[PDB]
Amino acid sequence: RNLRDLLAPWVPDAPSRALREMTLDSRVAAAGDLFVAVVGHQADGRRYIPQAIAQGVAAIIAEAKDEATDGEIREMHGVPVIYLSQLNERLSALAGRFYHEPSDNLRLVGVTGTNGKTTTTQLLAQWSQLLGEISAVMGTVGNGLLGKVIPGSAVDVQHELAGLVDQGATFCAMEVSSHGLVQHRVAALKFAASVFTNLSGDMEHYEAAKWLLYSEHHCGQAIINADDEVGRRWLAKLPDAVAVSMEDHINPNSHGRWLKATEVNYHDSGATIRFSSSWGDGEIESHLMGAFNVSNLLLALATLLALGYPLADLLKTAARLQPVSGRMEVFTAPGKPTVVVDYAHTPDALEKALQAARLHCAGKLWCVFGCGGDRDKGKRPLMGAIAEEFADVAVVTDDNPRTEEPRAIINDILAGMLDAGHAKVMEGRAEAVTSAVMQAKENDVVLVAGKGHEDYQIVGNQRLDYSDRVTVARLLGVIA
Numbered sequence: 001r002n003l004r005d006l007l008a009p010w011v012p013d014a015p016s017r018a019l020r021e022m023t024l025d026s027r028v029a030a031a032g033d034l035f036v037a038v039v040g041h042q043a044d045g046r047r048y049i050p051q052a053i054a055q056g057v058a059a060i061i062a063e064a065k066d067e068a069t070d071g072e073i074r075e076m077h078g079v080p081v082i083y084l085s086q087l088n089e090r091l092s093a094l095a096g097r098f099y100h101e102p103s104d105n106l107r108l109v110g111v112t113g114t115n116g117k118t119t120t121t122q123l124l125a126q127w128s129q130l131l132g133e134i135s136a137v138m139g140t141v142g143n144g145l146l147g148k149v150i151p152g153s154a155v156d157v158q159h160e161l162a163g164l165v166d167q168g169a170t171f172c173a174m175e176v177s178s179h180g181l182v183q184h185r186v187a188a189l190k191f192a193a194s195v196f197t198n199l200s201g202d203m204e205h206y207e208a209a210k211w212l213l214y215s216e217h218h219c220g221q222a223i224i225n226a227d228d229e230v231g232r233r234w235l236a237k238l239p240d241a242v243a244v245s246m247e248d249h250i251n252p253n254s255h256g257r258w259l260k261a262t263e264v265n266y267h268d269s270g271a272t273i274r275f276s277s278s279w280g281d282g283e284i285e286s287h288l289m290g291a292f293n294v295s296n297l298l299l300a301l302a303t304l305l306a307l308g309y310p311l312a313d314l315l316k317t318a319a320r321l322q323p324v325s326g327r328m329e330v331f332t333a334p335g336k337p338t339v340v341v342d343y344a345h346t347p348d349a350l351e352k353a354l355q356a357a358r359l360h361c362a363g364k365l366w367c368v369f370g371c372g373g374d375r376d377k378g379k380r381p382l383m384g385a386i387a388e389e390f391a392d393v394a395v396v397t398d399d400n401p402r403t404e405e406p407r408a409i410i411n412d413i414l415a416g417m418l419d420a421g422h423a424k425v426m427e428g429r430a431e432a433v434t435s436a437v438m439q440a441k442e443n444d445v446v447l448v449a450g451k452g453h454e455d456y457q458i459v460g461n462q463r464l465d466y467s468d469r470v471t472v473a474r475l476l477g478v479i480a
């Protein structure tokens with residue numbers, strides 16, 4: 001890494017200087033580093049130029065605004081300081097060149113939208129790896145190669161993608177928030193494809209701001225959920241975008257690329273998805289639960305078909321796709337009730353989990369749950385009301401009561417119900433889960449909500465060893 005080579009596209013005849021790491025933070029700027037002095041909200045990195053110089057940085061790139069002309073080369077204590085206009089917008093490009101353009105050295109797929117970014121990125125990474133990629137994710141669960149995901153500026157994004165390239169990643173599925181795009185954190189990334197899941201005078205400015213940003217980015221092939229009203233607005237302006245539907249929103253008059261589920265059977269162990277597309281037709285056995293996860297799966301499928309993965313190979317590997325751990329994770333055993341373990345610990349997440357479980361449920365829907373102690377009590381009656389409405393049998397139990405009287409939490413939950421007397425209450429959580437699993441019929445579904453993969457139960461100050469997944473697996477005679 002050399003300052004002169006790094007700046008060649010923008011500053012001819014910048015000085016020759018070996019560089020170590022690139023940093024926005026004067027505090028971690030070490031000998032041989034490139035310090036980048038940016039203006040943010042209130043913060044001005046140009047204040048820290050003397051400190052960075054004293055810590056032995058090789059060179060500094062600084063915001064030009066009010067200070068210097070674009071491309072102006074100064075020399076301070078023998079350290080080159082080069083000024084650039086609009087440094088915040090150009091940070092992604094500068095870091096991309098610093099880190100040897102990692103988005104040109106693997107297949108990068110971005111996913112944006114309110115919901116389904118995590119699931120859709122995990123399905124892209126899993127499916128591509130099943131077809132022979134070495135796949136990675138960058139998202140809210142963290143970054144890394146599949147199975148080794150460890151829990152953020154334009155530089156950090158480029159640096160982390162470069163670290164995955166260095167680890168041998170050939171495919172990366174990246175969550176991209178609306179806020180991420182606006183703050184120029186992915187401005188210079190070359191996406192092979194980008195995915196739109198959903199959105200949940202004003203409408204004119206919003207569209208105009210997003211169209212402007214999009215026109216500036218390198219998003220590759222567009223894959224868009226045509227069941228979303230805003231998604232259809234976007235498709236109307238993007239004739240080469242792939243339209244994806246499970247609710248009959250493909251308009252075949254367009255002669256564009258498309259994929260649509262013609263039939264979905266939600267059964268006790270997942271979903272049978274029959275689909276047609278401009279690549280051909282097929283039947284997928286998904287091990288994921290609910291309508292939203294059909295959509296997320298169809299977006300991943302359309303994306304990988306669009307990038308040229310063969311339909312026959314995608315169909316052959318679909319049954320190996322796994323749920324995101326602790327997210328609508330289904331446990332079935334021969335002639336036992338279906339059990340779903342989900343992390344839902346809010347009124348909205350619990351209602352969505354119950355509505356998703358209900359589709360797979362021929363019999364009674366059971367809901368085992370509780371609420372955290374020594375935290376906001378507001379959600380408790382609202383979660384009671386949700387369990388009473390959207391489940392057939394509500395089993396109210398403990399979930400991390402901490403130092404609060406466990407029964408007091410249960411009382412606050414029951415107070416939200418029309419008929420508290422209809423609720424079942426059982427303390428010990430292990431006991432309550434057992435009661436549901438052992439009483440439920442073969443065609444029932446038991447939702448165990450609130451913990452997902454969070455394998456402890458906090459009682460007083462003790463983090464007790466406890467897993468919903470292990471409890472359920474042992475009762476069903478299967479392996480968590």
Ligand SMILES: *[Se]c1ccccc1C(=O)Nc1ccccc1
Pocket residue numbers: 109110111112176181186191194195196214217218219222223224234
């Ligand atoms: Se641009 C980009 C880059 C990464 C991830 C997502 C996007 C994006 O905005 N994609 C998109 C939005 C709406 C319609 C099609 C595609």
